[PDB]
Amino acid sequence: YTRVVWCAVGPEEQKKCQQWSQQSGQNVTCATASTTDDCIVLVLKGEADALNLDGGYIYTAGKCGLVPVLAENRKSSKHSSLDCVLRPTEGYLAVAVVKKANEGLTWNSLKDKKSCHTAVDRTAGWNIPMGLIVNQTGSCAFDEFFSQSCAPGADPKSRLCALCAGDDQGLDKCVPNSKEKYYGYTGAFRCLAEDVGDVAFVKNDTVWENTNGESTADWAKNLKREDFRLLCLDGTRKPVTEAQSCHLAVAPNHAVVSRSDRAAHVEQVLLHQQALFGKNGKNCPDKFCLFKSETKNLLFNDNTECLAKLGGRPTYEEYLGTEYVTAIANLKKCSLEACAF
């Protein structure tokens, strides 16, 4: 079989894919979709082979029979003796971020405030925060909790999209892909950084990667970590240096998924691909690097050291975990066991 078709979401991920396709020598070809849900459909249809997904979407794909193949793994302090591919995933931290100057704003005073979400149906951006709020609220009206928000994937005409900007020409407002100015980790964080929303639901690495001259992007140039705070669940506020003791949850790393009858073939190709384009790959710094897309997190997160093997050949429920799976199920009874398509 040996040739893999990768599904790219949006035009920016497509242009990076073609570059990968080129350097691969047609080993990897691209398919494009305007949304992640459409990419899943393409993989079900068999028109695309695989794609890297956020846990939230892995639940969706899971109910449709797709399976996790390899997970993203970042550089850690613990487990240095083991190589990156055989090394277990540690998972990222879901947090709630705010401006320091915005005093008196805690977890208990979020109602009727403005929010910034990575996108609808995602772990740190939607599922974790909204699940918690639904519980504490005892109501399914999460569309009324915040006054205005930017949550890519929601109804454009609703308040949940009100804070989203769209692209260069203000078109595609609220679309769930990088054309939306406030889409994803970097998008949601910029949303807070520019003071559009009062809070942003991203992950811990995002704050660090886009502050203290790490990003070099016009909007991130002058951001200082000291100007930001994390909202803990006990109603306290802490510096971004205390994420381990002030997070909403710990999430399962983004993973590459595919149809179970293609997983073996997809896995084989990818390992060979990162041997060439990975962190220390033969052709990375020189020709092309798979895990670099100038802080835009295209196809993969920029902090990915390598895609790691799973081990225990886990199902999508085992990969996500029982904890998280019951959270999504509970949150979903608001908006019954079948593939959404």
Ligand SMILES: *[C@@H]1O[C@H](CO)[C@@H](O[C@@H]2O[C@H](CO)[C@@H](O[C@@H]3O[C@H](CO[C@@H]4O[C@H](CO)[C@@H](O)[C@H](O)[C@@H]4O)[C@@H](O[C@H]4O[C@H](CO)[C@@H](O)[C@H](O)[C@@H]4O)[C@H](O)[C@@H]3O)[C@H](O)[C@H]2NC(C)=O)[C@H](O)[C@H]1NC(C)=O
């Ligand atoms: C939003 O609200 C919902 C609704 O409350 C929350 O969903 C609930 O989440 C709970 C916590 O995850 C969950 O509670 C249960 O906890 C028990 C006890 O956990 C045990 O801990 C042991 C440590 O000593 C450990 O060794 C055990 O393995 C075990 O995990 C769990 O065990 C039950 O099941 C057994 C089945 O054999 C049973 O015999 C036993 O008596 C226990 O009842 C259980 O699996 C579960 O984790 C609860 O299930 C959830 N509620 C629902 C609707 O199912 C969400 O978390 C909230 N959202 C957010 C974001 O927080």
Ligand SMILES: *[C@@H]1O[C@H](CO)[C@@H](O[C@@H]2O[C@H](CO)[C@@H](O)[C@H](O)[C@H]2NC(C)=O)[C@H](O)[C@H]1NC(C)=O
């Ligand atoms: C496209 O895929 C083929 C098949 O894996 C690659 O050819 C192999 O490449 C490895 C290492 O790059 C060599 O050691 C093998 O001898 C090659 N032969 C095989 C098994 O076909 C090829 O390199 C890939 N092209 C790109 C640019 O990714």
Ligand SMILES: CCC(=O)NS(=O)(=O)c1ccc(-c2c(-c3ccccc3)noc2C)cc1
């Ligand atoms: C990506 C999220 C993740 O990997 N979570 S995990 O590491 O905590 C995890 C992985 C595998 C299992 C698992 C279990 C299990 C059984 C009883 C009690 C707890 C876990 N059984 O089979 C498998 C696979 C559970 C959690």
Ligand SMILES: [Fe+3]
């Ligand atoms: Fe995520």
Ligand SMILES: [Zn+2]
């Ligand atoms: Zn914790």
Ligand SMILES: [Zn+2]
């Ligand atoms: Zn198992």
